């Protein structure tokens, strides 16, 4: 039968996506749609998986199309849980696409339905999504409405943190703490940003999540710069560098060096500034990062000019004019 082949194809789609082969898995889900099935419930789950797979492949236009089909079918068959899920997914896709007004409505529907159904897990997830949308909306612009969007994000993240604490969901706390800390940073609440990123750091360590650990050090560094605590900030960027190398991440290593360069400039230790800027210059060429190469040149020109070396300043400015043209 069609229904049996459809399920077989869908199972393989799910296997391949879980194994991290979204490209191959998409084709199986699309084969499954091609064969077809009378079970609209099954079809709905295939659309939703296509939507997510295309989302992770960064084809957001396609993700939206498939989540909208899923949302519609969820209404057709009166699957309220499925409707809630499809709405959250559509809202998240709209957020990435920069369509924040509609994203808010969809994410709000995921929440409202989750409450109606007394689904605490879904409710929590929807509050995180909403925090994210309001954060992106505020950041995309403070005018009062912008401050209000960011403050609503804070509130949504705090509400989430409250529920996921009851649920014992540590990975969810990790996500909320990190985005809450970034929202505090945008609002100028720099002490609160540190507190949030400290919790995020702790959770990253608990999971052995090296990239989350590295994000948190880096975000902590940024908050301490705006607190005027430049020495402490350099210390955190030292931790990110050490982690960058460990992880053998070339780009991330280059950022840390740049960040340290700027931080010593604020401390007025121009020799160290030069040192790290050179290391950034080096890795930027390697990765084919032309934009980075120019920035290094400009930074180095300013450091050599403040240090006293009026020859190398001119040389790097000379190199800055080249890159800028090229």
């Amino acid at each position: 039968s069609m229904e049996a082949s459809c399920l077989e194809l869908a199972l393989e789609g799910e296997r391949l996506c879980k194994s991290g082969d979204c490209r191959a898995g998409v084709s199986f889900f699309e084969a499954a749609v091609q064969v077809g099935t009378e079970d609209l419930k099954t079809l709905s789950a295939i659309y939703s998986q296509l939507g997510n797979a295309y989302f992770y492949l960064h084809d957001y236009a396609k993700a939206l199309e498939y989540h909208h089909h899923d949302l519609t079918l969820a209404r057709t068959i009166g699957d309220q849980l499925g409707e809630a899920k499809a709405s959250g997914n559509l809202g998240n896709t709209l957020k990435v696409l920069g369509n924040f007004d509609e994203a808010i409505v969809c994410c709000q529907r995921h929440l409202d339905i989750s409450r109606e159904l007394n689904d605490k897990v879904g409710e929590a997830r929807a509050l995180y999504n909403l925090g994210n949308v309001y954060h992106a909306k505020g950041k995309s612009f403070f005018p009062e409405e912008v401050r209000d969007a960011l403050q609503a994000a804070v509130d949504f993240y705090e509400e989430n943190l409250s529920l996921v604490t009851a649920l014992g969901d540590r990975a969810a706390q990790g996500r909320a703490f990190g985005n809450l800390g970034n929202t505090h940073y945008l609002l100028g609440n720099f002490r609160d940003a540190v507190i949030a990123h400290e919790q995020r750091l702790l959770i990253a360590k608990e999971f052995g999540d090296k990239a989350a650990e590295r994000r948190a050090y880096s975000n902590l560094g940024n908050a301490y710069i705006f607190l005027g605590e430049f020495e402490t900030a350099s210390e955190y960027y030292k931790k990110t560098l050490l982690l960058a190398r460990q992880l053998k991440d070339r780009a991330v290593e280059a950022q840390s060096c740049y960040s340290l360069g700027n931080t010593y400039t604020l401390l007025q230790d121009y020799e160290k500034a030069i040192d790290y800027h050179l290391k950034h210059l080096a890795i930027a060429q390697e990765l084919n990062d032309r934009i980075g190469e120019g920035r290094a040149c400009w930074s180095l020109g300013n450091a050599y000019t403040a240090l006293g070396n009026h020859d190398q300043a001119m040389h790097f400015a000379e190199k800055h004019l080249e890159i800028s043209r090229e």
Partner: peptide, 19 residues
């Protein structure tokens, strides 16, 4: 200084939900 964000979650469905 760009703040680095945490990943989006997505909600997931499976054809096996109904086995």
């Amino acid at each position: 200084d760009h703040m680095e964000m945490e990943p989006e979650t997505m909600e997931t469905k499976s054809v096996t939900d109904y086995f």
